[PDB]
Curated annotation (Swiss-Prot), chain A:
Modified residues annotated as 3-methylthioaspartic acid in this record: 88
Identification of the protein by name: Small ribosomal subunit protein uS12
Modified residues (N6-acetyllysine): 107
Signal peptide segment: none
HAMAP family reported in the protein's UniProt record: Ribosomal_uS12_B (MF_00403_B)
GO cellular component: small ribosomal subunit
Any one biological process term the GO annotation gives: translation
Entries under Pfam families matching the protein: Ribosom_S12_S23 (PF00164)
Family to which the UniProt record says this protein belongs: Belongs to the universal ribosomal protein uS12 family.
Organism: Escherichia coli O45:K1 (strain S88 / ExPEC)
Any one Gene Ontology molecular-function term assigned to this protein's record: structural constituent of ribosome
PROSITE patterns per UniProt: RIBOSOMAL_S12
Domain of life: Bacteria
Subunit structure, as described in the record: Part of the 30S ribosomal subunit. Contacts proteins S8 and S17. May interact with IF1 in the 30S initiation complex.
From Swiss-Prot, chain B:
Keyword Cytoplasm: no
Positions of transmembrane segments: none
NCBIfam families reported in the protein's UniProt record: PRK00136.1 (NF001109)
Presence of keyword Electron transport: no
Subunit structure: Part of the 30S ribosomal subunit. Contacts proteins S5 and S12.
Cited function: One of the primary rRNA binding proteins, it binds directly to 16S rRNA central domain where it helps coordinate assembly of the platform of the 30S subunit.
Alphabetical UniProt keywords: Ribonucleoprotein, Ribosomal protein, RNA-binding, rRNA-binding
Name of one Pfam family that matches: Ribosomal_S8
Domain of life: Bacteria
Source organism per UniProt: Escherichia coli O45:K1 (strain S88 / ExPEC)
Protein name in the entry: Small ribosomal subunit protein uS8
RNA sequence: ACUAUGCUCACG
RNA sequence: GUUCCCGGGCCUUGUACACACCGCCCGUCACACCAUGGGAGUGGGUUGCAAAAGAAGUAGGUAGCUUAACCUUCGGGAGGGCGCUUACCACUUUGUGAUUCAUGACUGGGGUGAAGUCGUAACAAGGUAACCGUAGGGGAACCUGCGGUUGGAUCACCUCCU
RNA sequence: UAGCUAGUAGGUGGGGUAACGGCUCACCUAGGCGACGAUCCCUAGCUGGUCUGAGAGGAUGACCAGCCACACUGGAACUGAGACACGGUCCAGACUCCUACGGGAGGCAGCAGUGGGGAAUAUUGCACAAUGGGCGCAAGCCUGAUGCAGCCAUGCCGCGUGUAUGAAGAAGGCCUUCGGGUUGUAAAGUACUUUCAGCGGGGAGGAAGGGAGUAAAGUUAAUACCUUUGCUCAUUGACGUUACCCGCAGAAGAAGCACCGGCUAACUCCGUGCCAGCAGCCGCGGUAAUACGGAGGGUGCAAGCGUUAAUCGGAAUUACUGGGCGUAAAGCGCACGCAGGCGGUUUGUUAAGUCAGAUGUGAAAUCCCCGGGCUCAACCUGGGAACUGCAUCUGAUACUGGCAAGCUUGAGUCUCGUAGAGGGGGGUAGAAUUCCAGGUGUAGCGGUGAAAUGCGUAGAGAUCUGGAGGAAUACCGGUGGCGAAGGCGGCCCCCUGGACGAAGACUGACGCUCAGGUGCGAAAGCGUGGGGAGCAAACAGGAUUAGAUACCCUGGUAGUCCACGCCGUAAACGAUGUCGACUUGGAGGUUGUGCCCUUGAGGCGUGGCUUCCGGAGCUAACGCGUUAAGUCGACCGCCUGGGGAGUACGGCCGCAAGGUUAAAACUCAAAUGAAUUGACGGGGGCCCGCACAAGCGGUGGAGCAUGUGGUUUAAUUCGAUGCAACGCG
RNA sequence: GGGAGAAGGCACGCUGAUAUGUAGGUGAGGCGACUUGCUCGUGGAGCUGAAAUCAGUCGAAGAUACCAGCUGGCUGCAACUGUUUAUUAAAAACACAGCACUGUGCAAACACGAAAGUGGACGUAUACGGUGUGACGCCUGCCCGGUGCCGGGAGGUUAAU
């Protein structure tokens, strides 16, 4: 406030940080993968959630969630990554794209198959 | 310390109306009389004088129609911290043209309605709804 | 006088 | 007989409580993960200053060699061209800083994790009112001093007065 | 990032340049720049525009157009009108090349293409036919500039996938109120058309010309050559089996994929059981899931649909339009004050601002209206406004500024007083505490919830006598006063700051705020030197307790005191920045000064400062309320979710303790304020009941009966489990 | 204050010219004047004389000989200059300023001396002696059973007499 104060020091716009540092406004990004493993979520849930550490191509080391029943990821195996927090596993803030590269589709899905990467029956 | 005298005038009016008060004394001036005349001429204030020689005290006499006051609202636009000069076509119209904007133009102080037809703009002193 | 604690989640 | 004990009722107040004191809840310690500071250092990136360096070119200076047109008296003059040299200056070399990005044994705290250990610091007068500054102390919340705040509670307890 | 700069800044002598000039010399002067952010650091082509937005704005600079820059990296100049030259020369470099090893090459950020990078962007295509440009008298070369098409759901837009009738309301699925409904006019069908690709015949329109030999009219000595307008000719199409117009056949070749708990258009059955999985936000699953997986059923879009990333929007969540700061985040602890912002009142004059007209110009494109050509649209295009622009002369002078000379109401001076723990320096008083020696005197004192440590028969405690020393000032003393805030209490002098009142006189706007700057700033700390009764961190011992590094008790050092320097913080608080104006009241406190009879502790005003309650108004509410949190103005400070964190890093400051400035990653969907109803309290008040007291007899000990637990067993069926299960069903 | 001569650089010879040797330095005769001179100003005759700059110029090399720092980085100990085992130890040992404890009221404590007497000191507690520690900065925690020391004086024990 005070018009003179604003002339002297203008309104600094709140530079809101991005949720997903995959950099350069990239839709997806490849990842070599290390350590596929099971983790427990926060309080009201209780489960064994499937997750893997992603060694990205640009240099970053993140965790991506393995959405769907069962997976073909192990030790290495190159996978594709998209943006999206799970909102349960604290730390995990990316999603593996099922279908693309070594990450196969979920076995025997019918409803919603672009999600989870399955072809027609 | 008493930097803007014109804003102080318009508060004595606005606060005087709020108290249901008949008259409103204040220190006079050239510009005070100009504004107070434009308010009188359209019909917010019902008569005024400028009684005094050395130390002139301009007193207004506020109008009341019902129990409600006549001046619904009144506010300083071109305060001294931020002067506001508007062009002919860019002159405002308060309350969609049924309240007035007092505007100091080069041919004396006048209403925004008079300033349009006269064909000139100026410093918009106050809105009077 | 002083005198501790209550394992998790659950009322569209 | 109503002081205390157990329960209940009504009014009133405080409340960080609301499966509603069998309430909530603090910090250390243990374990897991993540980001993060310090760290003997190590390794790149950019860059300042102080120098050396001098390729080509251009400009100046010309003992040396050399020559179409001008002037020639057919001796040679002028003028050029090589070559040489001086200045500017590129690559490159040296020293020393600056900054920035990686990385480092170990280490300091921080965050996060359904059901670990130790206590109970706060919320009620939370059982020593709490908190703020500061100093010392202490496994841990914290405790104690000095000063400050009310964002403290009760005032039919006395026994006698407003 | 607060200082930077020596050809640096000027001037001249010379010198160069197309030309002005430190562009370059020689001297001469020693400046120039910078808080209106220099310098340094990071990032970046710029604009017309694009995108979003109601608009202001925010974002942005692909595609078309203008300008700049660069050409393997780093230099350099030459040649010309024009370059320090994109396929020029020249060096030096790195990295590929060819070498007969002496020496030679080479430069796709022109078009295709490769590897590589990547989440990801295209064919070693086709033609100069048009449209430019280069060349030339032109006949035409060359033109991967233009034109096209390969590829690509990557867009904006169009048409497709059939169209009538169809009851047995088929079956099969699917729910079943096993009666039936439902998918469902859906299908199968029963009639008709054939768009669209797929075959085939016709076949526009991109094309103006160019060229020949010609007539005339120009040209001229000339009916020659040349030129122009009539004028006769033949032809030119990459795209191209064009666009398009007719015929072939027969529904034929042509539909997904999201979603379905709320937000948000749309329901059930199974399978699973806090597992498997969904998740944009809230949140779904613990054996009857509308949220998970499946199925049907629906809904929403459909040649695309979802997800993803990215910008604006909603977000008035950086608020200029358009927010706030008593308690939610947020008033610096309080002053002084330069630069800066703002400034009472009255005439005169300039016109800087402002306003009015003036001409220029805002390249064309898009964007916007009236039109037009694509069969329609998309696209294309003609004109119009628009282009909210920025400059330029002329006036208007109200307002603001500049410059006048005032005026006196703000502000200040003097004059006489009033009150006050305002300050600083020096004295001195009385009570008491501790202690010191002395008299008396006989067992305890002290302390606590209760005890003990402690102190005492060496004679304490108690009592009195005389000292010594230190610190603090009972009562007065108050919702009293003073101070900017911090803060300041015995009495007396010394020096000293302000406040207020009374009526004048004087000055004549001298004012208000204040980033940096600077001062003062409780307590605790810190340094050097004094002092040291009481008190008392630390510390010790005795208790308490499960433990008690606490609370309680007995001891007790730094410190609290002083002088001088530092520190620079507090819930430094009315959690409320300073100054000024304005708008109903009541009761008081406190200090003035008037009018009246002091006629008797009064009668009646009117200034300061102050406490309490309340009106309008405001506020989320609580509350504030003429001492505003009301209504307005001036300026400053500050705020932008909670944690991380007032922390780290650097800077400054400090002897240190540390202060001050002040982030980011990461993480959470809350954190927060006020108030409401309960419940609770080792909160308060009032009551009650074999609740307790006052009794009386019991259980708990024994044996036995019964009933549970457990254990045993082939089975010891099952249920009931604090009170309110256990001689219970 | 330092570190710091940190490190690391570059320039130097000779000869001309600026200036037929200059900024300066010392300044004679001369000109006036004051008082009375071993005068003042005043002017500069010689004489002396760097250091620069610009140009030349020789050598492999110009501070050309003699002369005359090696430098930097991490670290233990001692703050420092100093002192020490004459003659195998120069150090981290001693001292040191500063720090604390402690004694000492002056005929001081203490010291040398059968003593007289000196020193301490012709000083007087901001002084003196002893002891430890060792600039400076941040600090210096707990124990008084043992041994010493200080104070206390009842009781017990206790010599000479
Ligand atoms: K203080
Ligand atoms: Mg579903
Ligand atoms: Mg206009
Ligand atoms: Mg426990
Ligand atoms: Mg609990
Ligand atoms: Mg619980
Ligand atoms: Mg009760
Ligand atoms: Mg009742
Ligand atoms: Mg209460
Ligand atoms: Mg409270
Ligand atoms: Mg309260
Ligand atoms: Mg409350
Ligand atoms: Mg619960
Ligand atoms: Mg509890
Ligand atoms: Mg905790
Ligand atoms: Mg914590
Ligand atoms: Mg050189
Ligand atoms: Mg050369
Ligand atoms: Mg030349
Ligand atoms: Mg040459
Ligand atoms: Mg010759
Ligand atoms: Mg010849
Ligand atoms: Mg001859
Ligand atoms: Mg000659
Ligand atoms: Mg010649
Ligand atoms: Mg170089
Ligand atoms: Mg280099
Ligand atoms: Mg860094
Ligand atoms: Mg590292
Ligand atoms: Mg590191
Ligand atoms: Mg390791
Ligand atoms: Mg655990
Ligand atoms: Mg835990
Ligand atoms: Mg407490
Ligand atoms: Mg507690
Ligand atoms: Mg307690
Ligand atoms: Mg307490
Ligand atoms: Mg407490
Ligand atoms: Mg409390
Ligand atoms: Mg502290
Ligand atoms: Mg201390
Ligand atoms: Mg400790
Ligand atoms: Mg322990
Ligand atoms: Mg303690
Ligand atoms: Mg305490
Ligand atoms: Mg204690
Ligand atoms: Mg209170
Ligand atoms: Mg009672
Ligand atoms: Mg000078
Ligand atoms: Mg819009
Ligand atoms: Mg908007
Ligand atoms: Mg728009
Ligand atoms: Mg481009
Ligand atoms: Mg342009
Ligand atoms: Mg290129
Ligand atoms: Mg090139
Ligand atoms: Mg080049
Ligand atoms: Mg160029
Ligand atoms: Mg070229
Ligand atoms: Mg080139
Ligand atoms: Mg070559
Ligand atoms: Mg080459
Ligand atoms: Mg090329
Ligand atoms: Mg290319
Ligand atoms: Mg290239
Ligand atoms: Mg390729
Ligand atoms: Mg192709
Ligand atoms: Mg071709
Ligand atoms: Mg061809
Ligand atoms: Mg061809
Ligand atoms: Mg061609
Ligand atoms: Mg052709
Ligand atoms: Mg052409
Ligand atoms: Mg052409
Ligand atoms: Mg021509
Ligand atoms: Mg021809
Ligand atoms: Mg051709
Ligand atoms: Mg060619
Ligand atoms: Mg071609
Ligand atoms: Mg085609
Ligand atoms: Mg498009
Ligand atoms: Mg697109
Ligand atoms: Mg049909
Ligand atoms: Mg269906
Ligand atoms: Mg049909
Ligand atoms: Mg059919
Ligand atoms: Mg049909
Ligand atoms: Mg067709
Ligand atoms: Mg035809
Ligand atoms: Mg044609
Ligand atoms: Mg043509
Ligand atoms: Mg023709
Ligand atoms: Mg053809
Ligand atoms: Mg052809
Ligand atoms: Mg085609
Ligand atoms: Mg065809
Ligand atoms: Mg075709
Ligand atoms: Mg036919
Ligand atoms: Mg037919
Ligand atoms: Mg839903
Ligand atoms: Mg609803
Ligand atoms: Mg719905
Ligand atoms: Mg059923
Ligand atoms: Mg879903
Ligand atoms: Mg059912
Ligand atoms: Mg189910
Ligand atoms: Mg469906
Ligand atoms: Mg869509
Ligand atoms: Mg998004
Ligand atoms: Mg927004
Ligand atoms: Mg906004
Ligand atoms: Mg605003
Ligand atoms: Mg806000
Ligand atoms: Mg708060
Ligand atoms: Mg607050
Ligand atoms: Mg304040
Ligand atoms: Mg204050
Ligand atoms: Mg000012
Ligand atoms: Mg004015
Ligand atoms: Mg005037
Ligand atoms: Mg005049
Ligand atoms: Mg005029
Ligand atoms: Mg015009
Ligand atoms: Mg025109
Ligand atoms: Mg125009
Ligand atoms: Mg557009
Ligand atoms: Mg267009
Ligand atoms: Mg149209
Ligand atoms: Mg068509
Ligand atoms: Mg047009
Ligand atoms: Mg147009
Ligand atoms: Mg036009
Ligand atoms: Mg028109
Ligand atoms: Mg027109
Ligand atoms: Mg335009
Ligand atoms: Mg004029
Ligand atoms: Mg006039
Ligand atoms: Mg001004
Ligand atoms: Mg002025
Ligand atoms: Mg006057
Ligand atoms: Mg005053
Ligand atoms: Mg008096
Ligand atoms: Mg006083
Ligand atoms: Mg006084
Ligand atoms: Mg006083
Ligand atoms: Mg005083
Ligand atoms: Mg004093
Ligand atoms: Mg006394
Ligand atoms: Mg006494
Ligand atoms: Mg005695
Ligand atoms: Mg005695
Ligand atoms: Mg005892
Ligand atoms: Mg005892
Ligand atoms: Mg005794
Ligand atoms: Mg004794
Ligand atoms: Mg005795
Ligand atoms: Mg006694
Ligand atoms: Mg006594
Ligand atoms: Mg006494
Ligand atoms: Mg005394
Ligand atoms: Mg006061
Ligand atoms: Mg005040
Ligand atoms: Mg005095
Ligand atoms: Mg004052
Ligand atoms: Mg005064
Ligand atoms: Mg007065
Ligand atoms: Mg005046
Ligand atoms: Mg006057
Ligand atoms: Mg200030
Ligand atoms: Mg300040
Ligand atoms: Mg101070
Ligand atoms: Mg003070
Ligand atoms: Mg001070
Ligand atoms: Mg103090
Ligand atoms: Mg002290
Ligand atoms: Mg000290
Ligand atoms: Mg001392
Ligand atoms: Mg003491
Ligand atoms: Mg005590
Ligand atoms: Mg105590
Ligand atoms: Mg303690
Ligand atoms: Mg003891
Ligand atoms: Mg204790
Ligand atoms: Mg104990
Ligand atoms: Mg005591
Ligand atoms: Mg005192
Ligand atoms: Mg004193
Ligand atoms: Mg003093
Ligand atoms: Mg200070
Ligand atoms: Mg301060
Ligand atoms: Mg503060
Ligand atoms: Mg205070
Ligand atoms: Mg207070
Ligand atoms: Mg108050
Ligand atoms: Mg505050
Ligand atoms: Mg002030
Ligand atoms: Mg006054
Ligand atoms: Mg009210
Ligand atoms: Mg308001
Ligand atoms: Mg209210
Ligand atoms: Mg208030
Ligand atoms: Mg008032
Ligand atoms: Mg008033
Ligand atoms: Mg007042
Ligand atoms: Mg006020
Ligand atoms: Mg206010
Ligand atoms: Mg408020
Ligand atoms: Mg913020
Ligand atoms: Mg935040
Ligand atoms: Mg945050
Ligand atoms: Mg800090
Ligand atoms: Mg500093
Ligand atoms: Mg310091
Ligand atoms: Mg300290
Ligand atoms: Mg701050
Ligand atoms: Mg959490
Ligand atoms: Mg809060
Ligand atoms: Mg509350
Ligand atoms: Mg209770
Ligand atoms: Mg109660
Ligand atoms: Mg009964
Ligand atoms: Mg009883
Ligand atoms: Mg009995
Ligand atoms: Mg009995
Ligand atoms: Mg029993
Ligand atoms: Mg029995
Ligand atoms: Mg028994
Ligand atoms: Mg029997
Ligand atoms: Mg049994
Ligand atoms: Mg058995
Ligand atoms: Mg049973
Ligand atoms: Mg049972
Ligand atoms: Mg059971
Ligand atoms: Mg029951
Ligand atoms: Mg050296
Ligand atoms: Mg030096
Ligand atoms: Mg040399
Ligand atoms: Mg020489
Ligand atoms: Mg001479
Ligand atoms: Mg000469
Ligand atoms: Mg000579
Ligand atoms: Mg000479
Ligand atoms: Mg010479
Ligand atoms: Mg001479
Ligand atoms: Mg001379
Ligand atoms: Mg001379
Ligand atoms: Mg001379
Ligand atoms: Mg002399
Ligand atoms: Mg003489
Ligand atoms: Mg001479
Ligand atoms: Mg020399
Ligand atoms: Mg030279
Ligand atoms: Mg030479
Ligand atoms: Mg040489
Ligand atoms: Mg030498
Ligand atoms: Mg040496
Ligand atoms: Mg060193
Ligand atoms: Mg060692
Ligand atoms: Mg030494
Ligand atoms: Mg040492
Ligand atoms: Mg010696
Ligand atoms: Mg010696
Ligand atoms: Mg010796
Ligand atoms: Mg020796
Ligand atoms: Mg010796
Ligand atoms: Mg010997
Ligand atoms: Mg030796
Ligand atoms: Mg030796
Ligand atoms: Mg030595
Ligand atoms: Mg040593
Ligand atoms: Mg020593
Ligand atoms: Mg000391
Ligand atoms: Mg001492
Ligand atoms: Mg002796
Ligand atoms: Mg003697
Ligand atoms: Mg003596
Ligand atoms: Mg020693
Ligand atoms: Mg320290
Ligand atoms: Mg010790
Ligand atoms: Mg002892
Ligand atoms: Mg003891
Ligand atoms: Mg002993
Ligand atoms: Mg003794
Ligand atoms: Mg003794
Ligand atoms: Mg004795
Ligand atoms: Mg005795
Ligand atoms: Mg005896
Ligand atoms: Mg005997």
């Amino acid at each position: 406030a005070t018009v003179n104060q604003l002339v002297r020091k203008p309104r600094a716009r709140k530079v809101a940080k991005s949720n997903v540092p995959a950099l350069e406004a990239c839709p997806q990004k490849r990842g070599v993968c290390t350590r596929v493993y099971t983790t427990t979520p926060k309080k009201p849930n209780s489960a064994l959630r499937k997750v893997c550490r992603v060694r990205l191509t640009n240099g970053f080391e993140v965790t991506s969630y393995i959405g769907g029943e069962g997976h073909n990821l192990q030790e290495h195996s190159v996978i594709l990554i998209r943006g999206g927090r799970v909102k349960d596993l604290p730390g995990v803030r990316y999603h593996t794209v099922r279908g693309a590269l070594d990450c196969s589709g979920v076995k025997d899905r019918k409803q919603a198959r672009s999600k989870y990467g399955v072809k027609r029956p | 310390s008493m930097q803007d005298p014109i804003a102080d005038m318009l508060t004595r009016i606005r606060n005087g109306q709020a108290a249901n008060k008949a008259a409103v004394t204040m220190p006079s001036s050239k510009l005070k009389v100009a504004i107070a005349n434009v308010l009188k001429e359209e019909g917010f204030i019902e008569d005024f004088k400028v009684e005094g020689d050395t130390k002139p005290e301009l007193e207004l006499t506020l109008k009341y129609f019902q129990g409600k006051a006549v001046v619904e609202s009144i506010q300083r636009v071109s305060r001294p911290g931020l002067r506001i000069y508007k062009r002919k076509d860019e002159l405002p119209k308060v309350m969609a043209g049924l309240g007035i904007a007092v505007v100091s133009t080069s041919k004396g102080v006048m209403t925004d309605r008079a300033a349009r037809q006269a064909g000139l703009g100026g410093e918009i002193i106050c809105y009077v709804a």
